Scaffold this active site. Structure first.
Site, PDB file in Angstrom:
ATOM      1  N   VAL A 150       1.806   6.763   0.826  1.00 31.06           N
ATOM      2  CA  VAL A 150       0.454   6.226   0.632  1.00 31.06           C
ATOM      3  C   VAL A 150      -0.420   6.654   0.746  1.00 31.06           C
ATOM      4  O   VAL A 150      -0.637   7.738   1.686  1.00 31.06           O
ATOM      5  CB  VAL A 150       1.017   5.454   2.245  1.00 31.06           C
ATOM      6  CG1 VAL A 150       0.816   6.474   2.967  1.00 31.06           C
ATOM      7  CG2 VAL A 150       0.334   4.297   2.911  1.00 31.06           C
ATOM      8  N   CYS A 151      -1.667   5.655   0.816  1.00 33.94           N
ATOM      9  CA  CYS A 151      -2.978   6.101   1.061  1.00 33.94           C
ATOM     10  C   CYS A 151      -3.964   5.213   2.230  1.00 33.94           C
ATOM     11  O   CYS A 151      -3.859   4.342   2.576  1.00 33.94           O
ATOM     12  CB  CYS A 151      -4.117   5.617  -0.385  1.00 33.94           C
ATOM     13  SG  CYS A 151      -4.133   3.773  -1.022  1.00 33.94           S
ATOM     14  N   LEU A 152      -4.667   6.449   2.997  1.00 35.40           N
ATOM     15  CA  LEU A 152      -4.893   5.569   4.400  1.00 35.40           C
ATOM     16  C   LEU A 152      -6.328   5.966   4.718  1.00 35.40           C
ATOM     17  O   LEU A 152      -6.544   6.971   4.567  1.00 35.40           O
ATOM     18  CB  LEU A 152      -4.587   6.166   5.251  1.00 35.40           C
ATOM     19  CG  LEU A 152      -4.352   5.690   6.760  1.00 35.40           C
ATOM     20  CD1 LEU A 152      -4.073   4.723   7.179  1.00 35.40           C
ATOM     21  CD2 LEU A 152      -4.214   6.409   7.149  1.00 35.40           C
ATOM     22  N   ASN A 179       0.621  -1.223   0.091  1.00 34.97           N
ATOM     23  CA  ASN A 179       0.500  -0.164   0.024  1.00 34.97           C
ATOM     24  C   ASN A 179       0.957   1.241   0.231  1.00 34.97           C
ATOM     25  O   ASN A 179       0.400   2.546   0.206  1.00 34.97           O
ATOM     26  CB  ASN A 179      -0.864  -0.330   1.468  1.00 34.97           C
ATOM     27  CG  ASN A 179      -2.243   0.889   0.666  1.00 34.97           C
ATOM     28  OD1 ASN A 179      -2.776   1.541  -0.288  1.00 34.97           O
ATOM     29  ND2 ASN A 179      -3.151   0.758   1.673  1.00 34.97           N
TER      30      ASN A 179
END
Ligand code: ZN
Ligand code: ZN
Ligand code: ZN
Ligand code: ZN
Ligand code: ZN
Ligand code: ZN
Ligand code: ZN
EC number: 2.3.2.23
Lengths: 86, 370, 574, 142
Positions: D83-85, D76
């Site tokens: 990073v995509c949260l 991810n």
């Protein structure tokens, strides 16, 4: 007897006894001449061909088709002529 | 007495245009009127507040019949699906506030007034009009506009919000659309929604109604998107894929470049007609068919251009062979007509008219499916 | 003389211009003094400057004195004089453009600087036929670049406005007739063409302007409160010229050809060309079967002329197919008549293509007499003998004949169609009786609308004096026909001569409304019930069909195959 | 406008707790708009890392951006730090979550992977070694 008959004139229209009434290649009415023959202004020569698969097309269009591929356009059975017009 | 009833003594098979589609251009004021009429109709048939009516309408694409039958089915689930009613000391700015300054939605989550005022302004400055929702996590209850106007402080904003709401309302409505042209206050209205050709009457922009991209007659809207994006044994696979891509792209690019020599050939045809007129070989009315022939040729080239992407995706069968045969015939007729009209010194009116009829029939043959 | 005496020479030229070897000598001195830079820099510049100064100082005075009236003539004279003087004095033996420069200066100083004042009067001069001055204006303005566009615009506007106004001024008569409409169009075209020829010497630009204006005028539809009436009127005029009418009777072949050529010339500007060839096709279809063509070679050449003028091929090809089918049918009819040896010399047949002619296999129901019923199988077998894969559809709306009517006064000959014949044979077995509307519907197997139209035709003919049939309840239109109307055969019909022949077919219909099979099924069913009741009664009570005809003298006349199948059904059910 | 009180309250709250999953963190010398992290999950078991927190103005009303300084191997996480949260995403963000919840979600996502590197996703279709050996090698390398 009263109101007898003296002279009569009759008018009738003739058309090809086919089904689906379309060449399925040029998509024109089977009872009209093909594009090339009406372009050359030659009439009374476009007969209609029938096949063993009951497919009724122009003779001109199907001759131009079989000059390259010897199969029916609408099916896969090996084309062979059964009846010709005129 | 002999010529009285002649007008009613003379078909639907080929007369109709297989690419006809009726539309109408609308401005913003008339769109406001239409939307207001729909609002005051639904909010009365289904008695609610006007804002609640608009939130219900946007969820179902402004279809009166579907909404009105789902209501009688189950009004409760109707309201829930529209994200209006919840499904059956301030947590944002941690402080303590008098109960007189607390404002809450239907979900009853309580937050004070200052954070409510600032949240809406921050999200409006981003550029959203309907995305405003409750602060607390995991509740999608959107806020009606009458709950957003009193919070907004000034008059510079409170007008951007209306523009955003108008844009989203027009986008969600199934019968309306926005002109893709730059700075065009125009709206397109059609009685039924379908993928056909639509032209603006102000900026003269041509586009498809659904995808808002360029017109694509014998091709699906989603199919052309991936074509536009694109434009050992595995080695053989890659080589063959590139080979067929080139085999289609050569014709695609031929026509793409040709669509500028449309006007260029228009110029040469004007020159030739002017020459023959100025040499006293006739009059203006005797040479007007060349322009019509040129327009027909350009139309045929456009139609043929937007068939190769569609033929690239057919599954191998008799239909593919028939389509390729018809494509070859139309190409040959196109070349013959272009040679007769462009690189010839003589001209025969009857021959060119017959050729034009044949070419038009050949073009019409391809659209037998659409 | 580098600079001396140049002023004196210019002064002498100026004095001459106001009102001879010295100037030529000085010019030769500049030419041969020293390739010709000195001649271009000096002398020539002085000449051009003096000319420009003199005209810039003189022209407005004469303009103010002699109006726009005399200014064009003054300008033309001045340019001619300057051109002659320039040829006489300035150098021309060394391929120099001095004369071109002086002429350009004169044009720029006498015409360009007054173009607005000159063109202000163009709008008023085009009307009231001021051609003599218009020619001079055109000649002067052709020199200045792009100075003739307002002339073309004014001509366009004048032609459009005059055409619309003149056509509106006489509209209570033009719309109904056709020859007057064509004459009006030709009159306007000829007047405008003559104006262009006399005022502009057939300049191509003015011809183009006239063509555009005429196309705008012809296709206008202000008359008829607006549709598609112009092609209909043109087709009607062509039909009147090409049919056996008094107008075609009082004319020869050359005048007919000239009129057709004029009509084609007018028609060349028509936009909606898909309606003219649909009306002309119907008229030709009516003419080729009634055999009412005044001349045949003119009709043959008309299709070629129509192809030349620019008609769509889809209809010209059909017309050619029709013309070939006529000859094919004539040969077939001769062959059938020869082979067949009701007399065989009084029957004619025509077999025509279903594509060029009417294309609709919609069933039409009508009761036929015995002779016509028995004739069909013979023709069908004769056709199927040679041709293979072809099938025939009999068209009852376009067949015709002649019948004999025996009355108390005498006998006559009547020209009728199939529907009229079927209606008239209803009184064969009851000459002196009366038949109602319902019984006529049952006997003739016809729908309501066709029966009403045929009854109107046989009871109220427009120009006829004494009618053939008689009605009991008075009515003013076929629409108000009831089921209680009784019809009788007139017994004093004449025309008072005791013999003759009259025609009851005027503009035979080619199409009819759609037919519903429910009414036909009901009528047929009632026929089976009535015939079975009658035959059962006769059985309870060779000559069987004779007594069936005798007893069924008030319902209908039974057919042979129906009787045969009914008796087969009876013997099946005992 | 209110981008302060929430910040000091959150710092006081996280200072009082002193969790063991998150070892220690520094205010980056009175910056008040961003600081640097140090996570310690308990694959990536061994190794102390650095995370750069980006707090825009009006922090409660805007999504705090997340990025990694030290390059690490995870499906991810992009090459450097992207990073995509989902909890701190642009659409799935609510102005009521606090920094404690988002850092807990980050620790959870570090603990186990989610099936940006599409190649590592394709490996994860049938990954045992390509997640238990190479990742261990990189972690003990850094
Ligand atoms: Zn064909
Ligand atoms: Zn042919
Ligand atoms: Zn077949
Ligand atoms: Zn608050
Ligand atoms: Zn909530
Ligand atoms: Zn627009
Ligand atoms: Zn589209």
């Amino acid at each position: 007897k009263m109101f007898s008959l003296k002279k009569w004139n009759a008018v009738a229209m003739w058309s090809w006894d086919v089904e689906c009434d379309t060449c399925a290649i040029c998509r024109v009415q089977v009872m009209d001449a093909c594009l090339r023959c009406q372009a050359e202004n030659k009439q009374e020569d476009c007969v209609v061909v029938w096949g063993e698969c009951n497919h009724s097309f122009h003779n001109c269009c199907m001759s131009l088709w079989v000059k390259q591929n010897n199969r029916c356009p609408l099916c896969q059975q090996d084309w062979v002529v059964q009846r010709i017009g005129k | 007495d002999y010529y009285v009833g002649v007008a009613s003594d003379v078909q639907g098979a080929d007369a109709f245009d297989p690419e006809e589609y009726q539309f109408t251009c609308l401005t913003y004021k008339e769109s406001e009127g239409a939307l207001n009429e729909h609002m005051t109709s639904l909010a009365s048939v289904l008695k609610v507040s006007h804002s609640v009516a608009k939130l219900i309408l946007v969820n179902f694409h402004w279809q009166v019949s579907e909404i009105l039958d789902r209501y009688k089915s189950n009004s409760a689930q109707l309201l829930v699906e529209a994200r209006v009613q919840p499904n059956p000391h301030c947590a944002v700015c941690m402080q303590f506030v008098r109960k007189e300054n607390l404002l809450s939605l239907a979900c009853q989550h309580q937050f004070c007034r200052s954070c409510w005022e600032q949240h809406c302004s921050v999200l409006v400055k981003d550029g959203v009009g309907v995305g405003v929702s409750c602060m607390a996590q995991d509740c999608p209850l959107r806020t009606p506009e009458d709950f957003v106007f009193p919070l907004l402080p000034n008059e510079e904003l409170r007008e951007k919000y209306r523009r955003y709401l108008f844009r989203d309302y027009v986008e969600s409505h199934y019968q309306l659309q926005l002109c893709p042209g730059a700075d065009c206050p125009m709206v397109i209205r059609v009685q039924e929604p379908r993928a056909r050709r639509v032209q603006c009457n102000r900026c003269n922009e041509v586009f498809c109604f659904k995808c808002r991209q360029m017109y694509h007659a014998p091709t699906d809207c989603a199919t052309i998107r991936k074509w536009l994006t694109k434009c050992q044994s595995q080695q053989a696979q890659a080589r063959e894929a590139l080979k067929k891509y080139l085999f289609y792209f050569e014709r695609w690019e031929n026509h793409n470049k040709s669509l500028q020599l449309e006007a260029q050939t228009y110029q040469r045809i004007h020159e030739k007609i002017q020459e023959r007129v100025m040499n006293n070989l006739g009059t203006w009315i005797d040479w007007q068919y060349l322009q019509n022939a040129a327009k027909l040729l350009a139309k045929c080239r456009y139609t043929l251009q937007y068939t190769y992407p569609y033929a690239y995706y057919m599954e191998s069968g008799p239909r593919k062979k028939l389509f390729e045969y018809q494509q070859a015939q139309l190409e040959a007729e196109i070349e013959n007509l272009s040679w007769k009209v462009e690189r010839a010194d003589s001209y025969d009116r009857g021959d060119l008219e017959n050729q034009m009829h044949i070419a038009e029939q050949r073009r019409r043959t391809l659209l037998k499916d659409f | 003389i580098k600079n001396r005496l140049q002023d004196s020479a210019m002064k002498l030229v100026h004095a001459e211009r106001l009102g001879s070897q010295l100037v030529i000598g000085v010019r030769e001195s500049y030419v041969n003094l020293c390739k010709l830079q000195i001649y271009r820099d000096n002398f020539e510049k002085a000449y051009l400057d003096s000319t420009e100064r003199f005209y810039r100082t003189q022209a407005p005075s004469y303009l103010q004195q002699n109006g726009v009236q005399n200014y064009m003539k003054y300008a033309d004279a001045k340019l001619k004089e300057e051109e002659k003087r320039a040829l006489r004095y300035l150098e021309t033996r060394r391929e120099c453009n001095s004369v071109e420069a002086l002429m350009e200066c004169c044009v720029n100083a006498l015409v360009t600087s007054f173009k607005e004042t000159i063109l202000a009067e163009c709008q008023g001069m085009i009307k009231r036929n001021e051609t003599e001055k218009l020619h001079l204006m055109f000649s002067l303005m052709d020199k200045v670049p792009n100075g003739i566009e307002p002339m073309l615009k004014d001509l366009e506007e004048h032609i459009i406005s005059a055409g619309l106004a003149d056509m509106v001024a006489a509209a209570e008569t033009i719309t109904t007739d056709s020859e007057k409409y064509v004459e009006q169009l030709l009159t306007l075209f000829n007047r405008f063409s003559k104006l262009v020829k006399e005022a502009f010497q057939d300049d191509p630009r003015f011809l183009t302007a006239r063509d555009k204006a005429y196309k705008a005028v012809v296709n206008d539809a202000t008359i008829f409160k607006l549709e598609s009436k112009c092609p209909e009127l043109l087709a009607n005029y062509c039909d009147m010229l090409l049919r056996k009418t008094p107008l075609s009777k009082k004319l020869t072949s050359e005048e007919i050809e000239a009129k057709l050529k004029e009509v084609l010339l007018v028609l060349k500007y028509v936009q909606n060309k898909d309606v003219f060839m649909r009306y002309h096709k119907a008229h030709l279809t009516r003419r080729l079967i009634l055999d009412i063509s005044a001349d045949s070679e003119i009709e043959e050449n008309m299709v070629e002329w129509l192809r030349e003028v620019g008609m769509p091929a889809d209809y010209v090809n059909k017309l050619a197919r029709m013309f070939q089918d006529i000859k094919v049918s004539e040969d077939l009819n001769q062959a059938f008549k020869e082979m067949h040896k009701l007399p065989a010399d009084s029957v004619n047949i025509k077999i025509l293509n279903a594509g060029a002619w009417s294309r609709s296999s919609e069933k039409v129901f009508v009761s036929l007499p015995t002779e016509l019923e028995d004739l069909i199988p013979e023709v069908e077998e004769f056709y199927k003998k040679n041709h293979s894969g072809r099938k025939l559809h009999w068209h009852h709306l376009m067949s015709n004949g002649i019948i004999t009517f025996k009355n108390e006064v005498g006998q006559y000959d009547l020209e009728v169609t199939t529907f009229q014949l079927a209606v008239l044979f209803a009184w064969n077995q009851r000459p002196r009786e009366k038949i109602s509307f319902e019984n006529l519907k049952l006997a003739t197997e016809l729908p309501d609308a066709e029966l009403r139209r045929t009854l109107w035709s046989l009871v109220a003919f427009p120009k006829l004096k004494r009618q053939v049939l008689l009605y009991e309840p008075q009515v003013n239109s076929p629409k108000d026909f009831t089921e209680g109307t009784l019809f009788s055969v007139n017994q004093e019909f004449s025309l008072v001569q005791k013999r003759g022949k009259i025609n009851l077919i005027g503009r035979l219909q080619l199409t009819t409304e759609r037919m519903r099979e429910e009414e036909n099924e009901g009528i047929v069913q009632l026929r089976i019930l009535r015939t079975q009741e009658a035959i059962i009664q006769i059985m309870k009570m060779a000559q069987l069909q004779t007594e069936l005809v005798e007893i069924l003298k008030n319902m209908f006349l039974p057919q042979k195959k129906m009787i045969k199948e009914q008796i087969e059904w009876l013997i099946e059910h005992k | 406008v209110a981008a302060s009180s929430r910040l000091m309250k959150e710092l006081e709250e996280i200072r009082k707790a002193g969790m063991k999953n998150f070892r220690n963190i520094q205010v980056d010398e009175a910056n008040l708009l961003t600081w640097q992290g140090l996570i310690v999950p308990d694959p990536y078991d061994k190794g102390a890392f650095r995370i750069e927190i980006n707090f825009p103005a009006e922090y409660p009303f805007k999504p705090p951006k997340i990025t990694f300084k030290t390059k690490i191997y995870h499906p991810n996480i992009d090459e450097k730090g992207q990073v995509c949260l989902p909890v701190i995403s642009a659409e799935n963000w609510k102005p009521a979550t606090k920094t404690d919840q988002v850092i807990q979600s980050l620790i959870a996502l570090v603990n186990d992977p989610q099936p940006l590197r599409a190649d590592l996703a394709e490996e994860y279709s049938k990954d045992r070694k390509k997640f238990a050996k190479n990742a261990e090698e990189f972690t003990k390398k850094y």
